[PDB]
C-alpha cells in the first residue's frame, strides 16, 4: 500500500553525467558511447548571453576550446557540432557505462525522472510532469544546465529532456536531447513567460482510480455524466478538456476498479464543484495530476483493495 511520486532508479544515468567547460562557464554533459551531449549555451560568455548568435560563436571555438571532465579522467575532444540547442563533442574514449538508450520527445502531461546535477555530479533525483504549457515545475540551482530528464524501460533509458533555463515564475524549461526546445522558449538570458497552465485531467482520473485501488471510494457517488457534460465543468475550473482517447486510454483501470470513466468523471465533477471537505485522498487535500496512467499501473498492486 502507498503511493508516492517515485523516481525511477537513477543509477544507469549517473554513470553518463560528466562536466563540460568552454572559458569560465561550466555545465553538466550526457556521454554516451563517444559523444557528449551539453547545451550550447556553455560558449557563452556574460557578453554573449542576452543576444547570443550560436553560429557566430561556434565557428571561433576548436576542439580544444572544450574542456570535458568525468569523474577524474579528462575526455579529449576530437570533434564538434551544434544539433539545435545542443552541442555534441566527439571526445576519444567511448563511455563504457553507456546502458542501451534512446531518445525521445515526450508529449504534455507525460512524466518523467531528473537527475540534478552539479559540475558533472549527481546531486538529486525527483519526479516531474511536463505540463501543457510545457514547463516542469523543477528544483534547479546556476551550474544545473545540463541535468536530463530520462524515462525506463526495463533496462533501456529514454531520455527526454535536458535542462536549459528557469523562467520568471520559478519554473523551468528545456529541450529534448535532439536540442529542440519544449514549448515557445529560447535559450537567451532573457525573462519569457510560460504560458497559461491547465490541469492534466486525464492524470487527475488516473489518480482517482489509484485510491480505489488503495482501497479508498469516499468520493465516488451514484451519478454519471456525459463527457460534454463534464467538459463543460472542466473549463469552468481550468482542467483539460476530456476526450474519447483519454476515456480509452483508461480502459484497464476501469476494468480493475469497475468503476466507468464516466461514473468516475462524474466523482469528479462533484469534487470540483463542491471541495474535498476536509478530507484526504491518497493522503492529499487537493486533486493531483502528476501522475499518469502508465505511472498509477507501475506503482499501484494490480488486485483493488475490495
Ligand atoms: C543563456 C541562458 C539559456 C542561460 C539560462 N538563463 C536563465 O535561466 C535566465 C532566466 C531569467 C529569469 C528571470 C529574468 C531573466 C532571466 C541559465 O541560467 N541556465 C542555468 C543552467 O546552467 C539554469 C538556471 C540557473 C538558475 N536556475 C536554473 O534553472
Not at 571532465?69 to 579529449?76: E, F, H, M, T, Y
Not at 530520462?150 to 524549461?173: K, Q, R
Not at 479508498?216 to 457517488?221: P, S
Amino acid at each position: 500500500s502507498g503511493f508516492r511520486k517515485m523516481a525511477f532508479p537513477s543509477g544507469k544515468v549517473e554513470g553518463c553525467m560528466v562536466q563540460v567547460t568552454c572559458g569560465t562557464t561550466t555545465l553538466n554533459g550526457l556521454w554516451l558511447d563517444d559523444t557528449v551531449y551539453c547545451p550550447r549555451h556553455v560558449i557563452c560568455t556574460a557578453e554573449d548571453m542576452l543576444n547570443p548568435n550560436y553560429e557566430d560563436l561556434l565557428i571561433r571555438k576548436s576542439n580544444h576550446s572544450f574542456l570535458v571532465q568525468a569523474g577524474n579522467v579528462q575526455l579529449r575532444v576530437i570533434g564538434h557540432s551544434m544539433q539545435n540547442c545542443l552541442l555534441r563533442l566527439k571526445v576519444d574514449t567511448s563511455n563504457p557505462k553507456t546502458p542501451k538508450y534512446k531518445f525521445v520527445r515526450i508529449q504534455p502531461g507525460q512524466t518523467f525522472s531528473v537527475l540534478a546535477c552539479y559540475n558533472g555530479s549527481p546531486s538529486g533525483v525527483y519526479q516531474c510532469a511536463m505540463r501543457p504549457n510545457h514547463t516542469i515545475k523543477g528544483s534547479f540551482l546556476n551550474g544545473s544546465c545540463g541535468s536530463v530528464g530520462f524515462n525506463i524501460d526495463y533496462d533501456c533509458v529514454s531520455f527526454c529532456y535536458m535542462h536549459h533555463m528557469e523562467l520568471p515564475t520559478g519554473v523551468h524549461a528545456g529541450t529534448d536531447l535532439e536540442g529542440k526546445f519544449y514549448g515557445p522558449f529560447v535559450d537567451r538570458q532573457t525573462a519569457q513567460a510560460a504560458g497559461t497552465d491547465t490541469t492534466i485531467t486525464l492524470n487527475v482520473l488516473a489518480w482517482l482510480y489509484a485510491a480505489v485501488i488503495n482501497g479508498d471510494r469516499w468520493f465516488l457517488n451514484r451519478f454519471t455524466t456525459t463527457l460534454n457534460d463534464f467538459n463543460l465543468v472542466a473549463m469552468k475550473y481550468n482542467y483539460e478538456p476530456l476526450t474519447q482517447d483519454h476515456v480509452d486510454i483508461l480502459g484497464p483501470l476501469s476494468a480493475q476498479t469497475g468503476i466507468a470513466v464516466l461514473d468516475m468523471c462524474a466523482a469528479l465533477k462533484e469534487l470540483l464543484q463542491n471541495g474535498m471537505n476536509g478530507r484526504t485522498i491518497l493522503g492529499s487535500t487537493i486533486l493531483e495530476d502528476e501522475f499518469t496512467p502508465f505511472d498509477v499501473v507501475r506503482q499501484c498492486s494490480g488486485v483493488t483493495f475490495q
